[PDB]
Design a protein around this ligand. Structure first.
Ligand SMILES: [Mg+2]
Ligand SMILES: [Mg+2]
Ligand SMILES: [Mg+2]
Ligand SMILES: [Mg+2]
Ligand SMILES: [Mg+2]
Ligand SMILES: [Mg+2]
Ligand SMILES: [Mg+2]
Ligand SMILES: [Mg+2]
Ligand SMILES: [Mg+2]
Ligand SMILES: [Mg+2]
Ligand SMILES: [Mg+2]
Ligand SMILES: [Mg+2]
Ligand SMILES: [Mg+2]
Ligand SMILES: [Mg+2]
Ligand SMILES: [Mg+2]
Ligand SMILES: [Mg+2]
Ligand SMILES: [Mg+2]
Ligand SMILES: [Mg+2]
Ligand SMILES: [Mg+2]
Ligand SMILES: [Mg+2]
Ligand SMILES: [Mg+2]
Ligand SMILES: [Mg+2]
Ligand SMILES: [Mg+2]
Ligand SMILES: [Mg+2]
Ligand SMILES: [Mg+2]
Ligand SMILES: [Mg+2]
Ligand SMILES: [Mg+2]
Ligand SMILES: [Mn+2]
Ligand SMILES: [Mn+2]
Ligand SMILES: [Mn+2]
Ligand SMILES: [Mn+2]
Ligand SMILES: [Mn+2]
Ligand SMILES: [Mn+2]
Ligand SMILES: [Mn+2]
Ligand SMILES: [Mn+2]
Ligand SMILES: [Mn+2]
Ligand SMILES: [Mn+2]
Ligand SMILES: [Mn+2]
Ligand SMILES: [Mn+2]
Ligand SMILES: [Mn+2]
Ligand SMILES: [Mn+2]
Ligand SMILES: [Mn+2]
Ligand SMILES: [Mn+2]
Ligand SMILES: [Mn+2]
Ligand SMILES: [Mn+2]
Ligand SMILES: [Mn+2]
Ligand SMILES: [Mn+2]
Ligand SMILES: [Mn+2]
Ligand SMILES: [Mn+2]
Ligand SMILES: [Mn+2]
Ligand SMILES: [Mn+2]
Ligand SMILES: [Mn+2]
Ligand SMILES: [Mn+2]
Ligand SMILES: [Mn+2]
Ligand SMILES: [Mn+2]
Ligand SMILES: [Mn+2]
Ligand SMILES: [Mn+2]
Ligand SMILES: [Mn+2]
Ligand SMILES: [Mn+2]
Ligand SMILES: [Mn+2]
Ligand SMILES: [Mn+2]
Ligand SMILES: [Mn+2]
Ligand SMILES: [Mn+2]
Ligand SMILES: [Mn+2]
Ligand SMILES: [Mn+2]
Ligand SMILES: [Mn+2]
Ligand SMILES: [Mn+2]
Ligand SMILES: [Mn+2]
Ligand SMILES: [Mn+2]
Ligand SMILES: [Mn+2]
Ligand SMILES: [Mn+2]
Ligand SMILES: [Mn+2]
Ligand SMILES: [Mn+2]
Ligand SMILES: [Mn+2]
Ligand SMILES: [Mn+2]
Ligand SMILES: [Mn+2]
Ligand SMILES: [Mn+2]
Ligand SMILES: [Mn+2]
Ligand SMILES: [Mn+2]
Ligand SMILES: [Mn+2]
Ligand SMILES: [Mn+2]
Lengths: 65, 127, 45
RNA sequence: GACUCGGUGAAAUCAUAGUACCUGUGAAGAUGCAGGUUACCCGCGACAGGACGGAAAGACCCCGUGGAGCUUUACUGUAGCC
RNA sequence: GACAAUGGUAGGAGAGCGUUCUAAGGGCGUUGAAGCAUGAUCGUAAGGACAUGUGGAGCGCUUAGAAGUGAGAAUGCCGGUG
RNA sequence: GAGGGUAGCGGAGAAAUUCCAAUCGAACCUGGAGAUAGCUGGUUCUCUCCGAAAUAGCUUUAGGGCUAGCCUCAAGUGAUGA
RNA sequence: ACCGAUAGUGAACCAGUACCGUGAGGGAAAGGUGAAAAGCACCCCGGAAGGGGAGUGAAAUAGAACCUGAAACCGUGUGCUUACAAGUAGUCAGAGCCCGUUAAUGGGUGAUGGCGUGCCUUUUGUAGAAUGAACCGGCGAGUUACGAUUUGAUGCAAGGUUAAGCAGUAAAUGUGGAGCCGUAGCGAAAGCGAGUCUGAAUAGGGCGUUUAGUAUUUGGUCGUAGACCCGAAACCAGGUGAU
RNA sequence: AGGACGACAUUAGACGAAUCAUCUGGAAAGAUGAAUCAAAGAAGGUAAUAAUCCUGUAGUCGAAAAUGUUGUCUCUCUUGA
């Protein structure tokens, strides 16, 4: 059987790069006005899946790009 | 030489047989070295993802073909029985420059930085 | 032309298009009609 | 009944066994370790201190995001009824 | 030729021994195959030969391929016998 | 006594969780079935080189797990290490 | 390149049979004389069984519970040794006695001296009085498929490569270029493009540019499968039972 | 929408090629010395391992009947743009 793609992650990954998974970022939903405007503006810009986690999540997005 | 064969050196290695004597006769020692030992790959005991999701996907997406077209000294195009594009959904012609020959390009949606050079040696545009 | 099926040894005979790596390795000699050898030379290129 | 003879002839257990005691030692209660003490080799009839004796993967206690049975103003439901 | 390194559980890496089947090559075998028994034999190990007795059909060697490929423990299963 | 009836989400019970073919807080048999078992037990040839950890962080987590840390193998960097 | 009598069907043999249960239902064990029955006329001890001869046979030291006939276990004979000694049974040292080999600084035994608490598991730590095994034999656990990733090997290379399907001898191979991956990336997207995104910005900053892939395959590992093996108390579904 | 003619097939079967001597031995197919066949050197059997000893194999014929099976007549049915 073909490995299934964890489509719940794929709805939040975006591959591209030279193999790196792109981003999406936390605390970005609701409940503002407790984060700083500094925290607010900076969590807006996106950052990759970490080396240590790509070690763990490597299998699920095997079909992304 | 059918009785004195030999595989290419470097291919082929004797597979590892665990559990067959005391040059290793095991795997781990307790916990999940139980048969069909779990942990989901992912399921690290608290979220893992659960952190944002950004999505869509729609329709129309072209198929690129960069100006590395050192073809003939002229002639028309889209003819890709020639060894260039294949599996095309459209055909944009992009850059990475070297319009070293003069010809007449033809495909749908040409890139401006490209077509500035294609038309600066022989002129060429189409749908 | 192969009612030599029944010779001890030496009893593979096939068109130069049914040719296989076994014989040609197995067999320690090989004998060829021309045109047969031409038909190989055509395809091999 | 046991016990002696004739007849017939099991079993639970059992790592291998040439299987002493003291004071110690040590997974902190030793036939088997140390240091002494004691003891010729092999039966039989007896007795139960020890072999943490045999028997049953501790019913107590805890644990497992085990089970089942039971209760209710636990939740979610449903046979039925107004 | 000197000179260094070489304790080791989980565990990583490496090189190998043997078992059955296949392929090709090259062989042994009723003037006695496998198996079994015995030996004071050889190799760093897994392991390999040789001699004799037994036995009365078969079997090895080289190279490569493939595996139901290696047992001392599971209150393991089955048999036999303590 | 003889012939009968009530059957397991059921039956019977002068009532004890009592009986339903020699253990009934829910009979037996066959199937789903290799239920599931973060638990215990077991896991078979040899030599050679290296060689841990029992900590941190989070965890309906606490004898389980994930990432880090420490092991190995391989590439690479190339004095950054002591 | 499936088993070869504990394997392979439960069943190589008169197996759904002995056997067990009221029933539904569960369910074994057990193959092999020899080329040929020539299956031991005859004498002998014995009621017989069984046996010594004589015989058939290449062989019965193949004689029927019959090819081979391991080990545990049981016995007969006996070369060295043993009744003042405290012993995980060996190891190292070693006289005496007996023997004579795959002939090699030999073999058997062993007065006596030194040393010395089995193995497995599990453990911070087990001689452990924690667990397991009466012994001997056989059987008995990391597999395969399909995906993923990585390494190694080989072919081509800015390309690489086929799937079904036809053809073929259940091949190899010929065919088949739908298809997949690669040559371009960036953005949620419209989209622009060696650059794009955010941005008001031709500031800065993210990802990318400067060049190598791809197909098969040995190995490692993961995923899907029972997925290394054995083990529940239980749950559901159909049935079978008030002797 | 049901039945009359002769090809093949299924269900019994037949033909089918070519070896001798010796040594060992209980027995020859083994070894060895000379041969032969082959559209047949697949396999099993025979006192040990056999292309030439037997059953066979390649190959060739073969069916009273019975089904099955079709080519083709008939057979129906036909009005077609
Ligand atoms: Mg994209
Ligand atoms: Mg992030
Ligand atoms: Mg032929
Ligand atoms: Mg009395
Ligand atoms: Mg024992
Ligand atoms: Mg005593
Ligand atoms: Mg009780
Ligand atoms: Mg209690
Ligand atoms: Mg509890
Ligand atoms: Mg003889
Ligand atoms: Mg009761
Ligand atoms: Mg019953
Ligand atoms: Mg029950
Ligand atoms: Mg701790
Ligand atoms: Mg410490
Ligand atoms: Mg008589
Ligand atoms: Mg025999
Ligand atoms: Mg014996
Ligand atoms: Mg403890
Ligand atoms: Mg013990
Ligand atoms: Mg190149
Ligand atoms: Mg930029
Ligand atoms: Mg940049
Ligand atoms: Mg039910
Ligand atoms: Mg003879
Ligand atoms: Mg001859
Ligand atoms: Mg024979
Ligand atoms: Mn999806
Ligand atoms: Mn997501
Ligand atoms: Mn929002
Ligand atoms: Mn804050
Ligand atoms: Mn290996
Ligand atoms: Mn264990
Ligand atoms: Mn573990
Ligand atoms: Mn495991
Ligand atoms: Mn399991
Ligand atoms: Mn008596
Ligand atoms: Mn100790
Ligand atoms: Mn003490
Ligand atoms: Mn007594
Ligand atoms: Mn008493
Ligand atoms: Mn317990
Ligand atoms: Mn070492
Ligand atoms: Mn050292
Ligand atoms: Mn290890
Ligand atoms: Mn390894
Ligand atoms: Mn040989
Ligand atoms: Mn064999
Ligand atoms: Mn096995
Ligand atoms: Mn038994
Ligand atoms: Mn009552
Ligand atoms: Mn009862
Ligand atoms: Mn199921
Ligand atoms: Mn189970
Ligand atoms: Mn070391
Ligand atoms: Mn632990
Ligand atoms: Mn290095
Ligand atoms: Mn420095
Ligand atoms: Mn047997
Ligand atoms: Mn009965
Ligand atoms: Mn017979
Ligand atoms: Mn008699
Ligand atoms: Mn005779
Ligand atoms: Mn017997
Ligand atoms: Mn016998
Ligand atoms: Mn004395
Ligand atoms: Mn004495
Ligand atoms: Mn003492
Ligand atoms: Mn001693
Ligand atoms: Mn001592
Ligand atoms: Mn072990
Ligand atoms: Mn004890
Ligand atoms: Mn225990
Ligand atoms: Mn025990
Ligand atoms: Mn055993
Ligand atoms: Mn892992
Ligand atoms: Mn696995
Ligand atoms: Mn004939
Ligand atoms: Mn003939
Ligand atoms: Mn003859
Ligand atoms: Mn024929």
């Amino acid at each position: 059987p073909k490995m299934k793609t964890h489509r719940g992650a794929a709805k939040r990954v975006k591959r591209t790069a030279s193999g790196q998974l792109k981003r999406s970022r936390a605390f970005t939903s609701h409940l503002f006005a407790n984060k700083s405007t500094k925290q607010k503006r900076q969590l807006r810009k996106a950052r990759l899946v970490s080396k240590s986690d790509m070690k763990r999540v490597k299998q699920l997005l095997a079909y992304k790009k | 030489k059918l009785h004195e064969l030999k595989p290419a050196e470097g291919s082929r290695k004797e597979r590892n047989r665990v559990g067959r004597g005391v040059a290793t006769g095991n795997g781990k020692t307790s916990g999940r070295g139980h048969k069909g030992q779990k942990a989901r790959s992912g399921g690290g005991v608290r979220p893992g993802f659960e952190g944002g999701q950004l999505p869509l996907f729609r329709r129309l997406p072209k198929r690129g073909f960069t100006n590395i077209n050192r073809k003939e000294y002229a002639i028309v195009n889209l003819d890709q029985l020639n060894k260039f594009e294949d599996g095309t959904e459209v055909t944009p012609a992009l850059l990475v420059e070297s319009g070293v020959v003069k010809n007449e390009k033809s495909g749908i949606k040409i890139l401006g930085n490209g077509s500035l050079d294609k038309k600066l040696t022989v002129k060429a545009h189409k749908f | 032309e192969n009612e030599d099926v029944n010779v001890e040894l030496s009893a593979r005979n096939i068109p130069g298009v049914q040719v296989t790596t076994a014989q040609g390795l197995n067999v320690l000699d090989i004998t060829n009609a021309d045109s047969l050898v031409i038909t190989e030379a055509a395809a091999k290129k």
